[PDB]
């Protein structure tokens, strides 16, 4: 399920920046992008028996609003800055220190790197029920697991280190 | 790191002409940079070539040179840094010179500030204090993020 | 917090459109409700902020058989006052009974303004005391507020009426008011008509044309009282922390008034304070005494002499007052807005709760009491005689009144600590 | 992903001739089709384009005794509009059975483009309910798309009419009309011209020509409307996916417009959000709530305000809803067009599901429901009769959208848990 290497090619003026470490970091926010992709389309092209339309917008809101967070917020803020500051490059070196501080706190906001098994796991794991609820189209011991893992999230993300309170809201 | 070293001072050189010569130092290392630095060079290099010690012409060099370092000092300081400004939030926040939030925000937040201490109140009572700030709707922007509760 | 105004009756809602009038000048408002280039003050507690900057008064206008309303609408401040809450005989009965009726709609029309503020803090009345329409209606009015909001306080901005006395069953009018706004009214600030038309034969040369001047007058007199709450600092910021120093006593709440410059149109703060004690300042017609005196003061003021100011007025001792209340005479101090004219740069007001203005009260009761006699005007109306038919609803506001006037002068004795 | 509208009727015809050549002007092409001389935006989605200079938009144009289609064919814009797919009462039963007859050709027409076209999303109809020979011929043409394109989807533009209630037989018209489209319409969106007619009377001074100017309006709604489609973006590029937070319910698919700057000819995102939410800025005409809140902000907005101004939004709580569903306002963000004027440099609109809709529809009910009883207008007319001489359908439409009307303040109701 979390394949798909992409790399590209580089000129040699521009390899020195653009180095062989730096293609890893852009290909692993590619393949978590396109997860989160892969949910919010899948809770989309489709259109007790309409009590699934409760657990439906109950869910597709929540992964909505975890897009909403990571390409407005980050992948557009920073991004938005790191563009008004490389239009002053006035050296080889800070090029690549201006760059590799672009992909270091890219990479420290979307959480990737630790708290892994802390935080980020829990995202994951709910991420399975947009898979799982996706197929099926047993409902009650899904919001059973759904208000417990949605409510775990939000009671052990509430320590926040402190950008995450802009999407503790929901 | 810098400071008088009283046992040293020789006693024909007062206390007061050094300590206008640590002022203009300590101005100097953290002004109107109009090089005078030479023309004092060359009143210092005249100075050195007198053969008595004179203190009413050593006070008089160093207290031309406080001078001078002082009245840019206030210039960048009130003009370019206004601190009239400054001590206008100071008085209406430390010294309770707003009078409808702080009687907004003991009205707003009186429970929680009644409740005992405890780690997770800090937040409580800066939101509150936000809220507390737009209760009393008149807001500018920024004005808030220079100032917080502990 | 946020303040609804409830102007009623035709001389009510006439005051209360120069009021607001008055306020859109002062404060950064055009006759649109639009803010101007031209123009830090908390405008929020008299003004709804709008989306777009229209300042829109929380003005209630009611109407009942309308011929002024229609004159306020053709103006150009009309877009100005833009709530869209005015909804449509000269007897206080016909006007409580024609009040009870749309009672229901009057009250949505109240419910809607207090959804749209956050808080809610009172209910200022323009009431007009034996104003045909306006008296009846705004004693049922300030009937049914209290009920609806207990926590809630009720302002009053009577113009009691003293015309040297044309409304022949004026004084039946204007006792059974002051029965209603005795029980049922937590403050009143008292106006007199004579006083403010000798005040307009001695300030000015006016006599025929007294009601359309004497309006500036009394807008002068709601706005300053309104100032130091209107604008930011510290300076008593919310209404009820004002209120509870000028009434001491559950019954005593009326309140009198005066302008140190009567002709508005450097003086430090010795003199301002000085002239204001002095009785043709005042704008009201046995040992006589004040219970508690404050003032507020806006202009170029000296802050350091302000206390051997208050020390010199006491040595003076312009001012009498030997109360069962400890209470002593408070200085307070507001800004002067921009824009309008600065002239007389310090300029002052002042609320004080005096026990004359039972004599001013008594004055009616005694016409009434001679009336009540002569029976000459019971009206004998069919509206006024179904709606009393024992007529001792007025013979329950004289009881009323006259436990307040012995209050009053139980106030003047060294033992309001007993009962008055 | 191209679409192609569905213009007919005389008035939807006259809308759709408008929003064509407002997204001439604003995309880079010229009268001709040819390309503009001074020409990022993806015309292809809008306009079929190939080598040939003329860019042809996927414009289906039906007339039906056709007066207005002549003075659509008499202007600059007809080498425009060239596919070539133009075929020749005020009853709908006269519209429908006028429909039934030639919906082979016009069917073909439509498959014709169909197949020209790479994918095509969805059909889009400019249509007027009760708009003679418009309504009818919709309903039956909405009845033929769905069965011959059952995975494809269809939005209705339409125009509601609201003219103060000549057309006698109106509330028949629209009510069956409506039976048809709750039914067979995946989506809609309504506009009403009571609504676009008091906007007009308060933005300007027009008042006689009406339907002139309110055409500017409906075509400033119907561009903003697609803007998030037509000029590429990060999200929202296709229809399905920007209409699909605002349907909750396959029932409730009607909704609601808004424009932040209503005259269009800096502002900050905290201010237009604030602005939206303002009854004013609506141009639609028990308790009562949203369903779901969209909006688009197109110009010169900042990124990181937004999420402040989402929650500035939270606590103001201008716009109140409790649906069944626990759905929430949506942020999102488009680019301005270059070479027309940035006039408001920021610049927005909402579409939004509200329960308010209901009364609207209520509102034709009544006036059938009053017509039904009188039987003044059944039209007897042989046409009429023979198509219908049971009369059924319009108690068959009746209870379908009785149905519909419940179904909303079941939407409101705390249980949509049971069936509305």
């Known amino acids: ?83 008004h500051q490389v239009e002053e490059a006035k050296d080889l070196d800070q090029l690549i220190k201006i760059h590799y501080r672009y992909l270091s706190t890219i990479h420290d906001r979307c959480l990737l790197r630790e708290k892994v098994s802390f935080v980020k796991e829990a995202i994951m794991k709910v991420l399975n029920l947009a898979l799982m609820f996706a197929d099926g189209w047993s409902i009650e011991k899904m919001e059973s697991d759904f208000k417990n893992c949605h409510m775990f999230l939000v009671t052990i993300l509430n320590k926040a280190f402190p950008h995450l309170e802009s999407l503790a809201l929901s | 790191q810098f400071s008088l070293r009283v046992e040293i001072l020789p006693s024909y050189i007062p206390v007061r002409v050094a300590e206008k010569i640590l002022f203009v130092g300590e101005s100097v290392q953290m002004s109107i940079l109009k090089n005078q630095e030479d023309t004092f060079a060359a009143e210092l290099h005249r100075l050195k070539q007198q053969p008595l010690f004179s203190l009413v012409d050593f006070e008089q060099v160093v207290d ?35 009078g ?16 005992p201490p405890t780690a997770v109140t800090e937040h409580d009572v800066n939101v509150a204090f936000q809220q507390s700030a737009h209760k009393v709707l008149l807001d500018d922007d920024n004005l808030l993020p220079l100032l917080h509760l502990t | 917090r946020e303040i609804i105004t409830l102007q009623l009756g035709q001389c009510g809602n006439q005051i209360g459109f120069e009021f607001w009038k008055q306020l859109c000048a002062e404060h950064g408002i055009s006759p649109e409700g639009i803010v ?13 902020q709008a989306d777009d900057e229209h300042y829109i008064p929380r003005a209630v206008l009611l109407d009942l058989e309308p011929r002024v309303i229609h004159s306020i ?23 409580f009974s024609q009040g009870e009726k749309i009672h229901e709609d009057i009250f949505d029309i109240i419910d809607r303004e207090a959804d749209g503020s956050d808080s809610l803090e009172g209910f200022v009345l323009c009431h007009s005391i034996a104003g045909g329409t306006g008296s009846g209606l705004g004693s049922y009015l300030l009937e049914r507020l209290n009920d609806r909001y207990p926590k809630k306080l009720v302002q009053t901005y009577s113009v009691f009426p003293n015309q040297d006395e044309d409304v022949v069953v004026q004084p039946y009018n204007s006792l059974l008011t002051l029965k209603r706004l005795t029980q049922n009214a937590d403050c009143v600030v008292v106006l007199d008509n004579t006083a403010l038309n000798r005040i307009a034969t001695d300030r000015l040369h006016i006599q025929n044309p007294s009601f359309s001047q004497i309006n500036q007058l ?77 003032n507020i003061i806006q202009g170029e003021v000296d802050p350091t002499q302000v206390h051997k100011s208050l020390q010199r007025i006491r040595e003076r001792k312009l001012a009498n007052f030997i109360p069962w209340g400890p209470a002593s005479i408070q200085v307070a101090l507001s800004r002067k807005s921009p824009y309008l004219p ?52 007025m013979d329950t506001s004289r009881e009323i009144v006259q436990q307040l006037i012995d209050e009053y002068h139980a106030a003047t004795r060294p033992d309001y600590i007993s009962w008055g």
């Open chain 1, 1 to 83: 399920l979390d394949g798909l290497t992409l790399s590209y090619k580089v000129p040699w003026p521009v390899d020195i920046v653009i180095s062989l470490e730096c293609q890893k970091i852009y290909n692993q926010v590619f393949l978590l992008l396109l997860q989160i992709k892969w949910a919010k389309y899948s809770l989309d092209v489709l259109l007790q028996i309409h009590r699934m339309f409760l657990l439906r917008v109950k869910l597709m809101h929540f992964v909505n609003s975890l897009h909403n967070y990571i390409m407005t917020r980050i992948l557009h803020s920073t991004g938005l800055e790191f563009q």
């Open chain 2, 64 to 98: 031309r040179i406080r001078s001078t370092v002082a009245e840019h000092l206030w210039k960048l300081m009130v003009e370019e840094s206004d601190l009239l400004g400054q001590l206008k939030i100071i008085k209406d926040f430390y010294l309770l010179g707003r």
């Open chain 2, 100 to 115: 409808e939030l702080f009687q907004a925000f003991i009205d707003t937040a009186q429970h929680m500030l009644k409740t």
């Open chain 3, 36 to 48: 101007e280039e031209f123009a830090t003050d908390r405008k929020d507690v008299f003004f709804y």
């Open chain 3, 73 to 95: 609408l053709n103006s150009p401040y009309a877009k100005l006052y833009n709530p869209e809450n005015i909804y449509l005989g000269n007897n206080w009965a016909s006007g």
């Open chain 3, 218 to 294: 009394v807008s002068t007199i709601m706005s300053a009282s309104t100032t130091t709450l209107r604008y930011p600092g510290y300076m008593n910021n919310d209404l009820i922390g004002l209120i509870a120093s000028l009434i001491p006593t559950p019954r005593l709440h009326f309140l009198m008034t005066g302008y140190t410059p009567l002709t508005t149109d450097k003086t430090t703060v010795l003199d301002v304070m000085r002239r204001l004690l002095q009785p043709k300042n005042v704008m009201v017609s046995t040992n006589h005494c004040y219970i508690a005196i404050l």
């Open chain 3, 342 to 393: 600065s002239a007389h740069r310090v300029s002052g007001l002042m609320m004080a709760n005096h026990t004359s203005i039972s004599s001013l009260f008594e004055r009616t009761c005694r016409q009434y009491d001679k009336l009540r006699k002569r029976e000459a005007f019971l009206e004998q109306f069919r509206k006024e005689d179904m709606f009393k038919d024992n007529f001792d609803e």
